[PDB]
Design a protein around this ligand. Structure first.
Ligand SMILES: O=C(Nc1ccc2ccn(CCc3ccncc3)c2c1)c1cc(F)cc(N2CCOCC2)c1
Length: 351
């Protein structure tokens, strides 16, 4: 049953993959992984193959490897990345040291859609509807994306959208410093660590994306974390009594009350010419208090998407057991858990 593997050096990386994968070519890499494009001769699909970099070098890395595979094996939704294959060249656990993941090849993301074409209200309707439909699914499994930005959304020529995560390196202080797309879509409560965050972090990110599809421009292109907070508060208004109380960071909470109070602005006078229903939806997404933000499920029932809403084709996820996240284990334990998931993978219906 075990395929035959062949070797190849590509940018100083030894790729050992099954013979089904041909025409391997580097797309990109980082600390957590290397990615190639290839052609899958079994399914006939252009695919991305990610080779994980030192997946078991520490506890943190091992747990991270296990986490991603558990996530990917669970996600089965039209608007969310599907796992086509996972494999390792190793014939046993003793020699299990490499993991490769395969999915459908992107190419075009929402970033290049927004820069290099005219988007109509009906295109915006369709693209945000598909982000929220994917999001209803993943939130239903208590999965939080936390890094939704236009580079993590794949968009094909028919305007069909998938949510993925193309993060190949760590989410460090330096990667979030300055004038960077890395921070522009983050809910303020996670950007400044105000509190224990909830899944409505992702809804904040949708609002910033929806706004950018409407105007063609970044909503909050802060030059640093504080400049970004100023851009945000200028639009949505400074916190009132109720929200401040909920900010457990005494340090965060005292910086806020130094700011001069500002009202929420008129969104119709920022988003000029836009569908009044878009503006309405945006006002419900872009709300400082995460408790009061619209959820994906609620947002799908909004008038703005009447053209597309179908309550019988907006599925929820099967229960997802995340108890491992509380679990403390050894590198070797995380590794064998990971091995069991590799060996147990069943590919999706062909094709
Ligand atoms: O996208 C993820 N992983 C992944 C798996 C396989 C491949 C192959 C290539 N890449 C890089 C991205 C890419 C894909 C296709 N074509 C070009 C590039 C992979 C990345 C991924 C990982 C996660 F930990 C969470 C989510 N989320 C969690 C929350 O819900 C959404 C899914 C997605």
């Amino acid at each position: 049953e075990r395929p035959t593997f062949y070797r190849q050096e590509l940018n100083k990386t030894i790729w050992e993959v099954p013979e089904r994968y041909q025409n391997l070519s580097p797309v990109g890499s980082g600390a957590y992984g290397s990615v190639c494009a290839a052609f899958d001769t079994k399914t006939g699909l252009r695919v991305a193959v990610k080779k994980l970099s030192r997946p078991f070098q520490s506890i943190i890395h091992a747990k991270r490897t296990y986490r991603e595979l558990r996530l990917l094996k669970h996600m089965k939704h039209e608007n969310v990345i599907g796992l086509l294959d996972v494999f390792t060249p190793a014939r046993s656990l003793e020699e299990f040291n490499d993991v490769y993941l395969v999915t459908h090849l992107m190419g075009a993301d929402l970033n290049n859609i927004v820069k290099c074409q005219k988007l109509t209200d009906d295109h915006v309707q369709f693209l945000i509807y598909q982000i929220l439909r994917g999001l209803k699914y993943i939130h239903s499994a208590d999965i939080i994306h936390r890094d939704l930005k236009p580079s993590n959304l794949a968009v094909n020529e028919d305007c069909e959208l998938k949510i993925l995560d193309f993060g190949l390196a760590r989410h460090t202080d330096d990667e979030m410093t300055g004038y960077v797309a890395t921070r522009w879509y983050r809910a303020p409560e996670i950007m400044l660590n105000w509190m224990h965050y909830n899944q409505t972090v992702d809804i904040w990110s949708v609002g910033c994306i929806m706004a950018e599809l409407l105007t063609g421009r970044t909503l909050f292109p802060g030059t640093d974390h504080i400049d970004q907070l100023k851009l945000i508060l200028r639009l949505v208004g400074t916190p009132g009594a109720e929200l401040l109380k909920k900010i457990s960071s005494e340090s965060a909470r005292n910086y806020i009350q130094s700011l001069t109070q500002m009202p929420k602005m008129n969104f119709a006078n920022v988003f000029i010419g836009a569908n009044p229903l878009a503006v309405d939806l945006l006002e419900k997404m872009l709300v400082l208090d995460s408790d009061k933000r619209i959820t994906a499920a609620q947002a799908l029932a909004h008038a703005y998407f009447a053209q597309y809403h179908d309550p019988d084709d907006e599925p929820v996820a099967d229960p997802y057991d995340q108890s491992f996240e509380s679990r403390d284990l050894l590198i070797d334990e995380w590794k064998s858990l990971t091995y069991d998931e590799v060996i147990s993978f069943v590919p999706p219906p062909l094709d």
